Amino acid sequence: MLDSLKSQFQPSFPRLASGHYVHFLMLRHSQSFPVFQTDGVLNTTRTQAGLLEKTDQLSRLVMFKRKQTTPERLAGRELLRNLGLTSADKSAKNLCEYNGEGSCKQCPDCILYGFAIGDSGSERSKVYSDSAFSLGAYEQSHRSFTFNAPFEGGTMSEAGVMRSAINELDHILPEVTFPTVESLRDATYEGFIYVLGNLLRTKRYGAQESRTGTMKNHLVGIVFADGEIFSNLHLTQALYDQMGGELNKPISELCETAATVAQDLLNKEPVRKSELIFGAHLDTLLQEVNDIYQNDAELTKLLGSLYQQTQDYATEFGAL
Amino acid sequence: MLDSLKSQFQPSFPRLASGHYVHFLMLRHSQSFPVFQTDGVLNTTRTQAGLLEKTDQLSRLVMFKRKQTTPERLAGRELLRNLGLTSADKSAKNLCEYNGEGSCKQCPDCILYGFAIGDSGSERSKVYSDSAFSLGAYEQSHRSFTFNAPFEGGTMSEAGVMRSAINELDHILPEVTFPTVESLRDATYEGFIYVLGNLLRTKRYGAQESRTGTMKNHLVGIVFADGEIFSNLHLTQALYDQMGGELNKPISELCETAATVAQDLLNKEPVRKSELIFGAHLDTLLQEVNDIYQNDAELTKLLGSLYQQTQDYATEFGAL
Amino acid sequence: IFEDYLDRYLEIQGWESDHQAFIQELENYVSKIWSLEMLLRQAFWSVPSGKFEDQQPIFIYLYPAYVYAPQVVEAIRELVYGIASVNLWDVRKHWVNNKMDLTSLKSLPWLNQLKYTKEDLPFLATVYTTTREKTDTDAWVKPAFLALLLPYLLGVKAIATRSMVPLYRSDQDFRESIHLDGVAGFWSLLGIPTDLRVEDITPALNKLLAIYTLHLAARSSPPKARWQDLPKTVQEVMTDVLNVFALAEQGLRREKRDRPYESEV
Amino acid sequence: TKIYRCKLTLHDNVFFASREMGILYETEKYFHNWALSYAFFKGTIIPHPYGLVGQNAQTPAYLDRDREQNLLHLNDSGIYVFPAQPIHWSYQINTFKAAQSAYYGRNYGRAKELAVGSEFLTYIVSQKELDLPVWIRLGKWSSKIRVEVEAIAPDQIKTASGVYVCNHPLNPLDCPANQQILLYNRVVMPPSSLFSQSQLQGDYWQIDRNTFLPQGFHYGATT
């Protein structure tokens, strides 16, 4: 599969955009109690439940704006350090400090996901991302749990003085799904393999990653296009309508339905679609990508090549 | 449908303006959290709530002309470079850069959306447009979200001292509607398809397009006229009054109401109206224009013809 | 450039003119001044050269309401040269005492029989803040308070801004009493308008002191006010009003006290 | 002969770079006559060339009879708009910038715009009945104005001559012989300063008991 896809991409990063979007259609299933918060409560918003038929308002959870790109980005940076293409010790020629000056301005994170701190300018993320919405309503999709913190002697009092450590936190239930399109503009073929790698290789999302928030990303389609397809809210409202809200369906039946609503929507978008990887072509492509990410020689070759492409871009058009 | 409308357009761009306006009536729906900002706050103004002589004032969000026209404009330039009608490489004969002395004087963007270089040439924008207003009040229509940025080590502290990255930002909510009229003067048929292309093909607006700001532009009518029709504000004040402020109604009922207020208004203003594309005549116009934007051969012919018309205008009447 | 600047913008009554001058003004159509004005601020206000945004300079400009009498411009001279560097710690104490009546604020020692008679009469009366922690909310808390306060004490019209150039006021530019150009986000979070008519200034002072006197109870320490946390104290109070008691209780726990005093209840 | 009272209401914020002071550019509280004349009558009477090149791209053509965009065409059609008096106004200071279109970036300004909450009053004078447009655009951003317009009937005008204080704005370049300016107050503006109030000697129209319009003004009459 990947041997044909190599044609679609550009040979090196351009200074201005040239169309060339690749859209990663996903369902993100919760597996273990995510927390998606700002301001101390689960992010939630009122929306129409579905596009044409079930036109009543409904409150759904929001996997807000950064929560679905920082996990990807940081897992890719860890890989760049495992492969030795970047380092985290001060006094090394390949340093990349996250969110400061001393960000590398040449590595795949700096070029694909962008930078803006200090001297030597700023770079727009070539990965385009969005806030995602729960397919079900907030009331069917969360629970509040209480947390204690007793003293190590095993009780909530330390001298007969009580310990003020009992609050409660709200967590998103398992098997709740967040439909998404994340989009990549002007990538090279290795840049596509890096970004796709982040989407398949990441597993944790919310607050309290150390204890919670494992998720299962099912990539349901890859679509090559001159520009952006439907919104994240629009895929969610289309998928809700296609089921009529009968959402208690096993995850395979739900992923197979998402593939069919996504193809219906793509045929109503003013976009030339060069390639539409779905179904048997996608579960071959995902297998050919698993074969890269399980092989040290293939992976070191492939991301080393990206490093050069991104460093070339840096000295020809970017910060150098 | 479009084959009959070929009768209305000019055959080539004229030197002096004419009074042939094609007006696009739209509802712009937020899909994910746009940021229509200047100066660090969401833009607002006090307005009368609706047209019937109200005592009642209402602070509504304002999306300035800049904040909507540039995302349409830059999404046209990207398409022209995808087709290879213009290029980003400085050694090519068809270079264009967005504003400076190196801005082109011939490409479709430069003639439809305008340029001002100085003594070396200037051109007025043929797409006239207005600042758009929220249908509802600001207090119902926005929320502020915290954002933080730790060390990659998961932590707000590095070397035991806190990183200064925590702040609020104000965001528009995912269903708030901005009625708009965009208007195009003295255009060719292919100029109308390019600009109508931008209206349907572009989808992200305001700040932070990399992570937020997805919008659905629902086109609600096209009106050919001997002069300019109502303002955005006047359409919003009519639409608020047709609903009596009962704003929590589904998007398709809001689009179906927007067609009926538009026709109610157009009857009252003294400009002569050649055509009025609404309802089932619009839904066939939209599908047959989507079929141009999905076909490689017809779009490369049609936008190529725009090029010639605009290169011909450049040498005959423009800046040469 | 200056000799032309007076001939462009100054008039004394009865200087001769012909409309054969406006012909030249059109013919000329077919600044270093503000750099000189900034040089006067460096010289006579003692503000920094070349490094100045890092001192977080906020200017309050005190326009007249319409007309001043000869005695009141002289009174505003005694203000702009004699104003105290405000400390919100005693402004709280004198307002929680006196049972929330903002008319108490009139009686505090706001200054440091005229003593400034050699100083220029203030036609554009500007007062300016400096703070020594480096953040914005810390920069805005004293200017926002002063910009509401001075119109309530003196009937003047305020613009608070980072900008060295002001909005110049005139007979219906005067249609608001206060503008605040770009306050820290604690202001927008409170939902208090960035522009206020004269009837609204006491509602604003009440909400601003109520949130300052609530932030300084919990999420503060006695020598260090921690105004860096003010946006969170505002966001919880605005979300649901019972959070006023949630903040009270935080105060009690810091103070290591299990129960409120009878007054605090 | 005919006179039209036009009330202009702002339907989006209006910006003109009337004076410039560091990073901030600001809009004067009076709409200049020559700006309104082209806003009402460009395309309908004065020509509207989309493009300009050479010196004509930087040099105005207000009163040049060789150039196309001249206000003298209006002298001929026998029309004259006066400048606009602000009845209710508000200002917004909003920043604007140039875009980073490229993936990599290394100017900007503040506009003091007149805001949507605003209304201005002008008067047009004509020898003939005029199809005035119920929408116009003004300024740096081609900003919409609702024009609601009424013809002043002969039952409420009267003609007289003597000394009168014009409470309206007026443009001194358009002042004829058989009018003389005794006293004036000015508002300083490109392309020319206006009077905001003046005492004149000459002929006038009492169009209501509390405004006086100078008779016989036309574009560039002093020049």
DSSP string, D44-78: TTB--BSEE-GGGGTS--TT-SSSSS-THHHHHHT
Subunits with 3+ Cβ pairs within 8 Å of B are A, C, D
Distances in Å between the alpha carbon of A52 and those of A243, B28, B83?
A: 12, 18, 35
Phi, psi of A292 (to 5 degrees): -70, -55
Probe site for chain D from A115, A119, A122 (most D CB atoms < 10 A): A122
CB count within 10 Å of CB D160 equals: 11
Distances in Å between the alpha carbon of A99 and those of A95, B150, B234, C203, D104?
A: 13, 8, 45, 41, 17
Residue pair A70/A130 in contact (Cβ under 8 Å)? The answer is no
Task: Answer whether C193 touches B (CB < 8 Å).
Answer: no
Subunits with 3+ Cβ pairs within 8 Å of A are B, C, D
Task: Report the C-alpha gap between D22 and C254 in whole angstroms.
Answer: 49
Beta bridge partners of B22: B184, B224
Task: Report the C-alpha gap between C76 and C63 in whole angstroms.
Answer: 10
- Helix/strand/coil for A71: helix
Separation in Å, CA of A225 to nearest CA in chain B: 10
Distances in Å between the alpha carbon of D128 and those of D125, D215, D217?
A: 9, 16, 16
The one-letter amino acid at B282: L
This structure was determined by cryo-EM
CB contact under 8 A, A164 and C253: yes
Phi, psi of B6 (to 5 degrees): -45, -25
CB count within 10 Å of CB A312 equals: 15
Cited resolution, angstroms? 3.1
Residue pair B104/B307 in contact (Cβ under 8 Å)? The answer is no
Task: Report the C-alpha gap between D193 and D186 in whole angstroms.
Answer: 7
- Helix/strand/coil for B101: coil
Residue pair D168/D30 in contact (Cβ under 8 Å)? The answer is no
Residue pair A288/A196 in contact (Cβ under 8 Å)? The answer is no
The one-letter amino acid at A71: P
Tokens of D36: 């309104």
B90 CA to centre of own chain: 29
The DSSP call for residue D215 is T
Reported for B268-272, long-range contacts at CB under 8 A and 24+ positions apart, including other chains, are B269/B229, B269/B230, B269/D134, B269/D135, B270/D131, B270/D134, B271/B225, B271/B226, B271/B227, B271/B228, B271/B229, B272/B225, B272/B226, B272/B227
Strands B177-185 and B127-129, how do they pair?
A: antiparallel
In the block, tokens 């560039």 appear at: D220
Task: Answer whether A123 touches D (CB < 8 Å).
Answer: yes
The DSSP call for residue D34 is H
Tokens of B231: 């303002």
Helix (H) or strand (E) holding A261: helix A251-266
* Nearest Cα residue in chain C from D59: C30
Task: Report the C-alpha gap between C142 and C147 in whole angstroms.
Answer: 9
Instruction: Please list every residue in chain A whose beta carbon sits closer than 8 Å to the beta carbon of residue C253.
Output: 164
Distances in Å between the alpha carbon of C172 and those of B132, C65, D86?
A: 27, 10, 10
Task: Report the C-alpha gap between B151 and A198 in whole angstroms.
Answer: 19
Residue pair B258/B179 in contact (Cβ under 8 Å)? The answer is yes
Phi, psi of D164 (to 5 degrees): -145, 145
* Cis upstream peptide for D191 (omega within 30°): yes
- Chain B residues bordering chain C (beta-carbon distance below 8 Å): 39-41, 139, 144, 164, 167-168, 170
The DSSP call for residue B258 is H
- Compute the residue count for chain A: 320
The one-letter amino acid at C138: D
Separation in Å, CA of A118 to nearest CA in chain C: 16
Task: Answer whether A17 touches D (CB < 8 Å).
Answer: yes
Residue pair B36/B208 in contact (Cβ under 8 Å)? The answer is no
* Nearest Cα residue in chain C from B39: C182
Output the 3-class SS for chain C.
CHHHHHHHHCCCCCCCCCCCCHHHHHHHHCCHHHHHHHHHHHHHCCCCCCCHHHHCCEEEEEECCCCCCHHHHHHHHHHHCCECCCCHHHHHHHHHCCCCCHHHHHHCCCECCCCCCCCCCCCCEEEEECCCCCCHHHHHHHHHHHHHHHHHHHCCEEEEECCCCCCCCCCCHHHCCEEECCCCHHHHHHCCCCEECHHHHHHHHHHHHHHHHHHCCCCCECCECCHHHHHHHHHHHHHCCCHHHHHHHHHHHHCCCCCCCCCCC
The DSSP call for residue A171 is E
* Nearest Cα residue in chain B from A13: B88
**Nearest Cβ partner for B38 among D11, D95, D133:** D95
Instruction: Please list every residue in chain B whose beta carbon sits closer than 8 Å to the beta carbon of residue D94.
Output: 38-39, 43, 64
- Helix/strand/coil for B144: strand
Strands D24-26 and D108-114, how do they pair?
A: parallel
CB contact under 8 A, D48 and B66: no
Separation in Å, CA of A161 to nearest CA in chain B: 30
* CB neighbour list of residue C262: distance below 8 Å, 6 or more residues apart: none
CB contact under 8 A, D103 and A126: yes
In the block, tokens 């081609």 appear at: D142
Separation in Å, CA of C4 to nearest CA in chain B: 28
Phi, psi of D86 (to 5 degrees): -75, 115
CB contact under 8 A, B17 and D48: yes
* Nearest Cα residue in chain C from D27: C167
Instruction: Please list every residue in chain B whose beta carbon sits closer than 8 Å to the beta carbon of residue D47.
Output: 16
Torsion of CA D39, D45, D46, D50, to 10 degrees: 80
In the block, tokens 């349409």 appear at: B72
Q: D residues 88-147 near A, CB within 8 Å?
A: 100-106
**Nearest Cβ partner for B98 among D49, D93, D101:** D101
Helix (H) or strand (E) holding A262: helix A251-266
CB contact under 8 A, A318 and D101: no
**Nearest Cβ partner for B78 among A18, A43, A65:** A18
Beta bridge partners of D24: D21, D110
Instruction: Please list every residue in chain D whose beta carbon sits closer than 8 Å to the beta carbon of residue B13.
Output: 50
